[PDB]
Amino acid sequence: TVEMVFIATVTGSLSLVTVVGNILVMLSIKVNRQLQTVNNYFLFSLACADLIIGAFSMNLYTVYTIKGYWPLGAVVCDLWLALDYVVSNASVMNLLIISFDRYFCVTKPLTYPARRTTKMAALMIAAAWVLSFVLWAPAILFWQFVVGKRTVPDNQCFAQFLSNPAVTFGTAIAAFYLPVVIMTVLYIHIYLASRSRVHGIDCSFWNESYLTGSRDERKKSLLSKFGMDEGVTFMFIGRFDRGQKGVDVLLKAIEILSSKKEFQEMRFIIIGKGDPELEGWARSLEEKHGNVKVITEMLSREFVRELYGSVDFVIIPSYFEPFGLVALEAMCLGAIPIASAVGGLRDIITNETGILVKAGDPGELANAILKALELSRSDLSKFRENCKKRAMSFSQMAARERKVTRTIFAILLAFILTWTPYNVMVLVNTFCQSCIPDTVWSIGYWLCYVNSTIRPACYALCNAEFKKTFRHLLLCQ
């Protein structure tokens, strides 16, 4: 009986992993202020239920397997059945709410995320747990009372309703099959809507690491490359059109400034091609003024990254701009945006992270360039740091939302792969009894328990913030 010690330790350590893993999930949500969102309220109840499974359900099932029979009597049996049947079904319901939540998040992105509340989450979690208890506890505990006899043998522990095969499959449909089909079709739709998505900036590319030396050094190097003196550098990048990028505003704005006493302190780099009439205008001002430089071509992002991390300001005179990645790209390299108050730009830029102007007004853009000239002092370094922080936090917002949706899919996938063997065994049992050996049935039962152990692992793998704080919690010892 040396094998008895082996199975008890393998499963005993598996019970320990589930208890450790879910306590760390629970503790991190409550301790870490960054993990206190509406989604993690539902992930907390999953860890609550999985802690119960790992601590109670697993240890009791270790007894059943090691002994070969149920030795703790009818009282402990009914309390083990009700506990297991409520907690497991609450987790199924929580997973169902979490999926519809992700579905609406993606299908109604301008209506539903505002309607999302922390109080609504708690009301939904309670509703799931209460509904599960009202649905399983009476069926588990009172079936023997209603019938008037306990049909369960003294050596076994199972729900009395399971004896009726019509109730067994009728419950597998309502508690597994139907909830899985719903969560499958909800996710097909999520994928379809996510396929047409517009991703933000590639933060692995747009960053200061690539640049060498000091900004003052790079700016002096860049200005001498275009054969120009040291001054306040203003840069434009984009298609030379009459419709949305608006080089004609900046071109008209330089003309207003060329009559001023501040013009000699300014430096202009105009990059892009398109309209030949607008290209010739840019080329005209380049000839008239030594502080104006024009590059009539669309340059690759690798050099634009160097330019953003060298120039003082970036002028975005967009007539129409829905997303404004150009602002975020420039802000990440320390460039201060002087942009039109349109679409995405209106959202990205604040009073502390750049100058906003009225679109299609060369007079207001000229005044803004003049305001930027007065800002030229030690105050630029602290302004640049605000532009970095804002663009990085803003880009982190779009990355974390898809990350949450990716985690819930991984938890649904984990759930499907672990409970399908047992549910398909139940399906085989309907027509073929003694088709499945007792050893194969036990593998099916244990896989349902393993789902509780692999859910914390899903949070560490699909979320970087969870993986880091897990190590921080074990640090305390």
Swiss-Prot record:
UniProt-listed SUPFAM superfamilies:
Family A G protein-coupled receptor-like
Its gene name is CHRM4
Name the UniProt record assigns to this protein: Muscarinic acetylcholine receptor M4
**What's a Pfam family in this record?**
7tm_1
Question: Could you state one GO cellular component term attached to this entry?
Answer: synapse
Q: What biological process terms from GO does the record include?
A: adenylate cyclase-inhibiting G protein-coupled acetylcholine receptor signaling pathway; cell surface receptor signaling pathway; chemical synaptic transmission; G protein-coupled acetylcholine receptor signaling pathway; G protein-coupled receptor signaling pathway, coupled to cyclic nucleotide second messenger; regulation of locomotion; signal transduction
Q: What is the role of the protein in this entry?
A: The muscarinic acetylcholine receptor mediates various cellular responses, including inhibition of adenylate cyclase, breakdown of phosphoinositides and modulation of potassium channels through the action of G proteins. Primary transducing effect is inhibition of adenylate cyclase.
The record places the following residue ranges in the Cytoplasmic compartment, namely 27-40, 101-120, 463-477
Where does the record say this protein resides?
A: Cell membrane; Postsynaptic cell membrane
Source organism: Homo sapiens (Human)
**Record's keyword annotation contains Transmembrane helix:** yes
